[PDB]
Ligand SMILES: [Ca+2]
Ligand SMILES: [Ca+2]
Ligand SMILES: [Ca+2]
Ligand SMILES: [Ca+2]
Ligand SMILES: [Ca+2]
């Protein structure tokens with residue numbers, strides 16, 4: 001499945017959401033370049049004004065297509081996400097906003113022809129109408145995060161739990177605790193990984209010529225946490241080691 005990702009792959013993202021009865025839809029288009037761990041995506045709220053802050057949806061849309069992560073060669077044996085392709089994987093999360101509501105997301109990530117599709121349903125409940133989310137108190141920016149991946153042998157898939165921190169307008173932070181589970185759609189074999197993490201950097205921007213409510217996302221994702229043999233083979237002073 002890795003061979004499906006050596007070039008630039010078109011991406012489509014479709015989301016329907018209901019957060020405290022505020023219904024919305026988003027369509028995204030992008031390009032994924034796993035050779036460089038690189039994603040470029042543009043999301044448009046097709047229903048009008050998005051009723052939650054754009055940053056709160058980044059992981060759902062993208063930490064949404066982790067098949068575009070760069071797994072270094074020495075780690076490619078641990079790449080569940082590409083191994084599940086083209087048939088795809090289910091990705092489910094609960095995202096719990098501290099002192100506020102939660103999103104539950106269910107997505108299917110798979111190829112449709114040459115295009116990698118992420119189809120999502122999102123349900124949000126227990127939000128405070130004047131809290132950081134429904135009150136639009138989150139800054140339009142995004143921090144770097146590590147996503148630790150573990151095998152879920154029972155389900156022939158993977159799991160992850162990680163904390164996203166969203167900068168708030170008053171200078172504080174809104175924690176969004178993520179629990180994630182992924183399971184393969186195909187009946188074919190998949191790679192079950194050793195423990196490792198995805199180091200993810202995300203930059204949000206806008207096209208000044210776009211009048212609709214939208215977000216541009218530029219993201220780089222690299223698998224890490226397992227040290228290549230090179231360091232000991234060549235005595236390279238940059239890894240953790242002892243004398
Ligand atoms: Ca392009
Ligand atoms: Ca092992
Ligand atoms: Ca040394
Ligand atoms: Ca070293
Ligand atoms: Ca040590």
Ligand SMILES: [Cu+2]
Nearest residue numbers: 148196197225
């Ligand atoms: Cu670590």
